[PDB]
Amino acid sequence: ELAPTDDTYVENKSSTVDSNFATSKQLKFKGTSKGSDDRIGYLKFDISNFKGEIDKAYIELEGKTSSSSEVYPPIDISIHGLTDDTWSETDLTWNNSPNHEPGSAKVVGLGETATFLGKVTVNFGEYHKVELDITDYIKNHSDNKDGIVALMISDQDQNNAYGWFRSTQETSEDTYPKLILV
Ligand SMILES: [Ca+2]
């Protein structure tokens, strides 16, 4: 059970394109038609101390979607593995963050520096767990041989649905993102 070394989000607003969010309890996401007000989350883990051969690996998050004006249907949020692990949580801003187009969350590098791992279904109004089996990526992909795992969290499908996952800045450790190594 590993907590991130790094977790943050970035946000596409003129007031916050140069802002860092590593102090927040939230890993925000949003994907809009135009890309304004998009948010992307990022995680890093260090698996280099895992004694033994990894058999299964899972990413677990805790999150929800949120609106005062409508009930969202379940929203599928994409998880990518990134080659780029060169950043720390305090480095990333919208303007300085990897694997997306400059005006929206649209992914850059698919199949090359960004590996699609799957989507997690996020539900409305109440925190819940999601989990994605990422065994093949952790066990086999070139990105993870250096022991530093980098993940991106985004809406790639323009749902125009705000939400967040809970970060390492929450008071309860049980809400943190978790990389589970068997
Ligand atoms: Ca790596």
Author numbering: -2 to 179
Task: Quote the original article.
Carbohydrate-binding modules (CBMs) are the noncatalytic modules that assist functions of the catalytic modules in carbohydrate-active enzymes, and they are usually discrete structural domains in larger multimodular enzymes. Recently, we reported that the marine thermophilic bacterium Defluviitalea phaphyphila codes for Dp0100, a 201 kDa multimodular and broad-specificity endotype alginate lyase that carries a PL39 family catalytic domain. In the present work, we identified a new CBM domain in Dp0100, which exhibits a strong affinity to alginate, and this added another functional domain to this multidomain alginate lyase. Phylogenetic analysis supports that TM6-N4 constitutes the founding member of a new CBM family denoted as CBM96.
Thus, the novel alginate-binding domain was defined as the 187 amino acids present in TM6-N4, whereas the upstream CBM35 domain does not play a role in alginate binding. Structure determination showed that this protein domain is a monomer and an overall architecture of β-sandwich fold. TM6-N4 exhibited an overall β-sandwich fold architecture with two antiparallel β-sheets. Examination of the bond lengths, coordination chemistry, and the nature of the ligands led to the assignment of the peak as Ca2+. The metal ion is coordinated by the carboxyl oxygens of Asp82 and Asp142, the main-chain carboxyl oxygens of Asp140 and Ile145, and two water molecules (W7 and W11). A broad and shallow groove is positioned within a loop region of the β-sheets. Using the crystal structure as input, an overall positively charged electrostatic binding groove was generated at pH 6. The mutants of K22A, K31A, and Y159A also showed remarkable influences on the alginate-binding ability, and substantial protein migrations occurred in lane 3 (0.15% alginate). These results indicated that the amino acids located in the bottom or the wall of the shallow groove, including Lys10, Lys22, Lys25, Lys27, Lys31, Arg36, and Tyr159, are essential for alginate binding. The single mutation of R36E can cause complete abortion of alginate-binding ability, indicating Arg36 plays a central role in alginate recognition, whereas most of the other mutants were retarded to the top of the gel. Moreover, the lowest Kd values were obtained with G6 (0.02 μM) and M6 (0.06 μM) substrates, indicating that TM6-N4 probably forms the most stable complexes with hexasaccharide. Therefore, TM6-N4 may bind individual alginate chains by covering six uronic acid units per molecule and exhibits typical properties of type B CBM.
